[PDB]
Design a protein around this ligand. Structure first.
Ligand SMILES: [Zn+2]
Length: 247
């Protein structure tokens, strides 16, 4: 991985030593990016609802994961499950139990730095994974993208700046998340997020991530070409909000 500082350096070293799991997957992969495009053709707002108990930006809640997932199943285009343990209080069991309980596509969100974490996502039932450009070298990113595709996944390649975007397009990403949060500093910049969105080709499936709480922002981003919206904190604190956000 890259040489980082602060909490990201810590989470990367933790991830390198993450013990892998063993299990026989039950259901074939179902595509999150393809379901997003189907929602777009149906003119249904496509929200990826995220389950996370804690975050470095101060979220700290307890909520039953299965009850949350079963509620979201009616409304969300997919789910994102945090599996990072130290900063997000996620776990592999959380992913396994949620995947075993819903039929919509599931994204495992963690700090993937080694192939066995993709093995873990597959064996636990996830349909895809996030790969974060700013924690990986270009060579690692290309290799992990190919590895995930060899299972039948289309990973969400996450970008925050123009250097990240250059890499993501160069390596052939087809499913890009544009996060407004710089994970190193926790700073939110929506202007920069909109700039990057405008630089992505129309045939790439685009997901806006971080800081979304209001239907007005979803509408404005949809007008700019965003295909789907990854929303965590606001839904973890008031799950029923997704109903208003999709209206
Ligand atoms: Zn993300």
């Amino acid at each position: 991985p890259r040489y980082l500082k602060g909490w990201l350096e810590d989470v990367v070293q933790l991830s390198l030593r993450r013990p892998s799991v063993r299990a026989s997957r039950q259901r074939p992969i179902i595509s999150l990016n393809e379901r997003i495009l189907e929602f777009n053709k149906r003119n249904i707002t496509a929200i990826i609802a995220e389950y996370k108990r804690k975050s470095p930006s101060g979220l700290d809640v307890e909520r039953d994961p299965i009850e949350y997932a079963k509620f979201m199943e009616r409304y969300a285009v997919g789910l994102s499950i945090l599996t990072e343990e130290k900063y997000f209080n996620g776990s592999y069991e959380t992913l396994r139990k949620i995947a075993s309980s819903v039929s919509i596509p599931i994204l495992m969100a963690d700090f993937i730095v080694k192939e066995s974490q993709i093995d873990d996502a597959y064996n636990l039932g996830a349909d895809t994974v996030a790969l974060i450009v700013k924690i990986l070298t270009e060579r690692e990113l290309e290799s992990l993208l190919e590895y995930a595709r060899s299972y039948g996944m289309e990973p969400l390649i996450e970008i925050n700046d123009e250097n990240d975007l250059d890499i993501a397009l160069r390596i052939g990403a087809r499913f890009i998340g544009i996060t407004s949060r710089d994970e190193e500093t926790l700073e939110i910049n929506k202007e920069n997020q909109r700039k990057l969105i405008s630089m992505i080709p129309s045939n790439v499936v685009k997901v806006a991530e971080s800081g979304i709480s209001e239907r007005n922002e979803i509408e404005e981003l949809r007008k700019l070409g965003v295909n789907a919206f990854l929303i965590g904190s606001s839904l973890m604190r008031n799950p029923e909000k997704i109903k208003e956000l999709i209206e």
